[PDB]
Amino acid sequence: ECITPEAIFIGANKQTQVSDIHKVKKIVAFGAGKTIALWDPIEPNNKGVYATLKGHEAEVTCVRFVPDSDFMVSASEDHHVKIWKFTDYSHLQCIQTIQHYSKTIVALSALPSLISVGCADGTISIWRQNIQNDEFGLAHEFTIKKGFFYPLCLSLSKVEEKKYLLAIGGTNVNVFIASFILSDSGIEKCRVVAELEGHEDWVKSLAFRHQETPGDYLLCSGSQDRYIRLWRIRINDLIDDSEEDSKKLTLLSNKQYKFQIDDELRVGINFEALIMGHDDWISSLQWHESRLQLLAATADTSLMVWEPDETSGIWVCSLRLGESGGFWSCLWFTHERMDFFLTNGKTGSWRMWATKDNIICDQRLGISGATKDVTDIAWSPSGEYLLATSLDQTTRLFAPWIYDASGRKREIATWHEFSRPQIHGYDMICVETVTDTRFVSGGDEKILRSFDLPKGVAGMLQKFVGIQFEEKSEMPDSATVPVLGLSNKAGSLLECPPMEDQLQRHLLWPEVEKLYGHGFEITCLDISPDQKLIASACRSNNVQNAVIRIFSTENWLEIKPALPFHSLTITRLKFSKDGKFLLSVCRDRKWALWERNMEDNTFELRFKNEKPHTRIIWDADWAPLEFGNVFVTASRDKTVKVWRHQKEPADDYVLEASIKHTKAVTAISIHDSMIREKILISVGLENGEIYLYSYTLGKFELITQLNEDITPADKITRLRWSHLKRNGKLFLGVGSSDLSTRIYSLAYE
Amino acid sequence: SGIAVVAVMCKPHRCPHIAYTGNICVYCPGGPDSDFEYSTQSYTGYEPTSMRAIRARYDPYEQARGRVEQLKQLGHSIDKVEYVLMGGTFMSLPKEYREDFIVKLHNALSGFNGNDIDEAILYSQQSLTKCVGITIETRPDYCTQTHLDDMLKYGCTRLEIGVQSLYEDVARDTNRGHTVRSVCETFAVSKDAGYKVVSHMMPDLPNVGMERDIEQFKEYFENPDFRTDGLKIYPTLVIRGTGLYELWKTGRYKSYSANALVDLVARILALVPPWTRIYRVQRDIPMPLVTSGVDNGNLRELALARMKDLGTTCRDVRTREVGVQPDQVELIRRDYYANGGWETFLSYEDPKKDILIGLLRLRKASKKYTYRKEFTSQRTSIVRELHVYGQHQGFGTLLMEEAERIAKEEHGSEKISVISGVGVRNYYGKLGYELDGPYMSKRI
Numbered sequence A: 001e002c003i004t005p006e007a008i009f010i011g012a013n014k015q016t017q018v019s020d021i022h023k024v025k026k027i028v029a030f031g032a033g034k035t036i037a038l039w040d041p042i043e044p045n046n047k048g049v050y051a052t053l054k055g056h057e058a059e060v061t062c063v064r065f066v067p068d069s070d071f072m073v074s075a076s077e078d079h080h081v082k083i084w085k086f087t088d089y090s091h092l093q094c095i096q097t098i099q100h101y102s103k104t105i106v107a108l109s110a111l112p113s114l115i116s117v118g119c120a121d122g123t124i125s126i127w128r129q130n131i132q133n134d135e136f137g138l139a140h141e142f143t144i145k146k147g148f149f150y151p152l153c154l155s156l157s158k159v160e161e162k163k164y165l166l167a168i169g170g171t172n173v174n175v176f177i178a179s180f181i182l183s184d185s186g187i188e189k190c191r192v193v194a195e196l197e198g199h200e201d202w203v204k205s206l207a208f209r210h211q212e213t214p215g216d217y218l219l220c221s222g223s224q225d226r227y228i229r230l231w232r233i234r235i236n237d238l239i240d241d242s243e244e245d246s247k248k249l250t251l252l253s254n255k256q257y258k259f260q261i262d263d264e265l266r267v268g269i270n271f272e273a274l275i276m277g278h279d280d281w282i283s284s285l286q287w288h289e290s291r292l293q294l295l296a297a298t299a300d301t302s303l304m305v306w307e308p309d310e311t312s313g314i315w316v317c318s319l320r321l322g323e324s325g326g327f328w329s330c331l332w333f334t335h336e337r338m339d340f341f342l343t344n345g346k347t348g349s350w351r352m353w354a355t356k357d358n359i360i361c362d363q364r365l366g367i368s369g370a371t372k373d374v375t376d377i378a379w380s381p382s383g384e385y386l387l388a389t390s391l392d393q394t395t396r397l398f399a400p401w402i403y404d405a406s407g408r409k410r411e412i413a414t415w416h417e418f419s420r421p422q423i424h425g426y427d428m429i430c431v432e433t434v435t436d437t438r439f440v441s442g443g444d445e446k447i448l449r450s451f452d453l454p455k456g457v458a459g460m461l462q463k464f465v466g467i468q469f470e471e472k473s474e475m476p477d478s479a480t481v482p483v484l485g486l487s488n489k490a491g492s493l494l495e496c497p498p499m500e501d502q503l504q505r506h507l508l509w510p511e512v513e514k515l516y517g518h519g520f521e522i523t524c525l526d527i528s529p530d531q532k533l534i535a536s537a538c539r540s541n542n543v544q545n546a547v548i549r550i551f552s553t554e555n556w557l558e559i560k561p562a563l564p565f566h567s568l569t570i571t572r573l574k575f576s577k578d579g580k581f582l583l584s585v586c587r588d589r590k591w592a593l594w595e596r597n598m599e600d601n602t603f604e605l606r607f608k609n610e611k612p613h614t615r616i617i618w619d620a621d622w623a624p625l626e627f628g629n630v631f632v633t634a635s636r637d638k639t640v641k642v643w644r645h646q647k648e649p650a651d652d653y654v655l656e657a658s659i660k661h662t663k664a665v666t667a668i669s670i671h672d673s674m675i676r677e678k679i680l681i682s683v684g685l686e687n688g689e690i691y692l693y694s695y696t697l698g699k700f701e702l703i704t705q706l707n708e709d710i711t712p713a714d715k716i717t718r719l720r721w722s723h724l725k726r727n728g729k730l731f732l733g734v735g736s737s738d739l740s741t742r743i744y745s746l747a748y749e
Numbered sequence B: 001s002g003i004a005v006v007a008v009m010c011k012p013h014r015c016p017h018i019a020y021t022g023n024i025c026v027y028c029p030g031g032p033d034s035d036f037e038y039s040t041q042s043y044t045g046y047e048p049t050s051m052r053a054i055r056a057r058y059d060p061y062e063q064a065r066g067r068v069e070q071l072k073q074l075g076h077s078i079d080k081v082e083y084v085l086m087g088g089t090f091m092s093l094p095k096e097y098r099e100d101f102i103v104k105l106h107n108a109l110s111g112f113n114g115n116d117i118d119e120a121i122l123y124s125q126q127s128l129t130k131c132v133g134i135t136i137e138t139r140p141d142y143c144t145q146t147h148l149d150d151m152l153k154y155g156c157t158r159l160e161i162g163v164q165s166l167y168e169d170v171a172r173d174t175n176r177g178h179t180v181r182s183v184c185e186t187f188a189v190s191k192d193a194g195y196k197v198v199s200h201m202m203p204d205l206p207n208v209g210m211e212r213d214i215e216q217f218k219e220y221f222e223n224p225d226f227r228t229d230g231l232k233i234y235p236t237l238v239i240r241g242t243g244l245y246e247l248w249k250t251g252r253y254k255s256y257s258a259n260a261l262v263d264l265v266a267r268i269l270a271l272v273p274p275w276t277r278i279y280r281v282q283r284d285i286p287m288p289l290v291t292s293g294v295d296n297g298n299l300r301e302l303a304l305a306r307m308k309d310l311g312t313t314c315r316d317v318r319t320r321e322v323g324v325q326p327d328q329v330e331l332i333r334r335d336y337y338a339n340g341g342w343e344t345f346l347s348y349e350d351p352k353k354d355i356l357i358g359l360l361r362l363r364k365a366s367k368k369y370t371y372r373k374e375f376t377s378q379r380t381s382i383v384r385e386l387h388v389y390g391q392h393q394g395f396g397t398l399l400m401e402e403a404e405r406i407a408k409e410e411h412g413s414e415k416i417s418v419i420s421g422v423g424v425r426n427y428y429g430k431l432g433y434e435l436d437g438p439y440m441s442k443r444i
């Protein structure tokens, strides 16, 4: 249709198996909150995250692609196991949801036409694909030890016709290996046959290597004692017979486990190698598709490749790279001649590295996002960037990448992160921009902050985005972190948007002024159109503190009087499209309005009301001066009402029309200009639907509903249109409670 | 070896008695409504624990993990760690923040990654770096039946209450927010739930003179209402932005000279009974911040030297252990009545060298109290801690052999129950005990 998804900014979770990768097509699917995000790391553009997948009502824990098929199995903390399938080429849909186990899922693995589920009460299950449909029936479940054994990770492979081997691990110092034979209906002879000792702490990760030599392959067993012990599994007629009268002093640690599966397939499992190091706990393990390397990720932000070198025999660290937190998951793939190194940290951001022939590694443009909820959105006053703040102590800067390092327009413009202005520890409730160089923010704190844009960002916003900044010899450079306090201190030739380590420390903005006055934590704020007065309101439940405080942005002090109207806590402030009026929208189901003195900056209560809506009211926005003195108000009672200044009896505003929706509407916006004597209004409600309307004097018109595949998955926090118009397209800024920040385009003549 | 003490601080917040009183405590420094930058309540930001918290930005998974592995870069070789929470009024925080806080305290030892409080403690039970207890400090109006069983789910075993005065006028005039007859009633429901109750006391408060301090602490151990298992002596320090700073400014409050204060605490330790311990004699505040009050930071040894030439030996259970070899030991017990129940204090002692080997607490469950479901279907007796220092090995199994024989015969009980922490739940499973909720009990 007309709308097009442009930018998805979602941040990964902190589990050790959030991610997998498809083999033929190269798509990275990582769990991120309640959704399952999809990302393509190889393309001439970068494009960021292109799609998310809905359905879970808790955070996603395990994501695994079924090898050599069109499926994908997922797991979460809502006790459910969902199965996905490709529909055309790069999108998926659920076809089965498991309603079992009554507990969360902690481990997961996959084979062709067979998966395996581990859950947090000591139960290890096996699911099997049947004929004639894509349905997974239950085959067998068991328990190692009832009250004492709790799983962490699972893997399984095949030997030669139908016989499989599964490797259980968790919560103790040993590794459990089972076996089961397949059949036409289900499985049978499922029992535990091995018990692998050697470790000192828990076993966090273990994986099988592919069977390169027929009848001989390896086994990695990483653990929480910083060690990465290996194993080696052989086959029939290659057992390395021992214990004969000419014995070899077998060194009972290498005691060469041995069992039978049924009668005709018997194996031998011995100890191979043992590696120290890693400086801390290790998270994830990966093998290679063809060669004989091994990837390991640790909990001290490190990532190193292990390789058996010649003329020594023993394992040695060949390629090590990485520059607190930790790396949780990691992946490998080769594209044409080189292989890529990608991983994630505690900020929900994907680091990426390229190298040639395992010698020279260099950076590569990765994607990022938030880890907790997104609260507020503020576009630039010229409209080429927007400041998306979140609930995880961060604030972002999202902007397009149009001009490259040379200066040519790229044939597709993509969205990335350029700056991360503040890292200081609060929940960052609200934010609003004043200029292209200054903005005013505020979190759960009794004061407000004010930051200035630095020169190191002004150089690259002018280069890569292509926007003009004049009078640049004044604002300072950028600092790193507040170490002697909490306020930010003062403190080229790039060819790309920056990497993650520059975003963490080398791109914060200096603070110019810290202004006092409220005494409680801030809810919302808004600034006048003439950039002269800032207004704010704090959280309370009392009439004594429900006061709008107005600060002049020159001397950063208070304006003398108070504004004592509301009772509980004000949820929305906006000035008009001129500077004449000022409405307030509160949690006490009523609104107020305040007019300006225009020479003393004093306010007076003029137009009040006491029962506009049934339930409480959330959001409000004004209409342009080409349309009239009009503002709209949404509310918890699943309705939205548009009101106009008319004065036949007296000077007051009265409602014109309304709609009733299905759920409670939480965010509304009006585009700053009109299209052929019609204004554009977009609404958003409490579980992820976004409607956009056209309105003309008491008559609405449902243009279209956004499709369910590209909408947010939780409640809408804000909606703001962009001021700029490029290529005949508009821009909407969407922020929701599914950890995501979205930007939609809309062409409409 | 020993026990590793890892101290964490929660989010900087406001006490909950600022609303209906109008302000916080008179002597309390710091907090959000102060001039110290980004500091927790009752702290200044210049403490070695409070400087690790600000650099961590109060993230519980990263604050605890940086502290644990720091102590094994020095080389303490830790395998038994006991958490303690401090700062603010942790149980006044919202419910969806408190449970997620405690979950990531357990994940820094086990390695499990999840958010369910009912499942994180099960993974933490078979941990190898194990937690022997969590100390959570609170106010006496936050120990109701709704809050005491939330601490049982969290893994808490010891809790600390700021009493700080036994007079009614002092708890009113310092804007403390409760009554002293209310804290002696919530001690009874806490000790019958199975907690090690430790209280805080503060000498040199306003309007309590020199002589009233010594009958304050004589009453504290003679009255069967209080008789707790621990104390933290916290003498009053005047800080910059506090409420009593203006009383120091206008000349309406003056402090003790540092010759009468060390004489006072040389008499307070003389009355300490052998079943309680003195954790602190003063708190870690850097002396450039303090204006009046305690001069130096060596009040512990100056108090032990002042009672050397008085003939009186401090018989404290923090002082009377190995830190000198026993070569022999006797078995004695002590019996006292504390706030509704019959407490007993079994220990292994040497009366000559005055040194302790092990100790144990046990309580008959009363009838006016004990709301818990597991302690109502029959008459039960509660063992509250076991604490053995360091053949010198079988002192644990002797104290459990004797506390069980004394429960069937002299208490007349049908079930004995332990309040063991999560990491030490497996030491009792070998001795025939079985888990039922927070407790590790057994039918007699």
Ligand SMILES: C[C@H]1O[C@@H](n2cnc3c(N)ncnc32)[C@H](O)[C@@H]1O
Pocket (backbone or CB within 6 Å): B027, B028, B029, B042, B161, B162, B164, B200, B201, B202, B234, B235, B236, B237, B238, B283
């Ligand atoms: C949180 C703990 O801090 C102690 N506390 C609070 N204020 C002071 C002070 N000025 N001096 C000493 N201790 C203090 C309280 O007694 C409480 O037990």
Ligand code: SF4
Pocket (backbone or CB within 6 Å): B015, B024, B025, B028, B029, B041, B042, B088, B089, B162
């Ligand atoms: S004393 Fe305890 S309660 Fe009174 S203010 Fe200081 S911290 Fe809050």
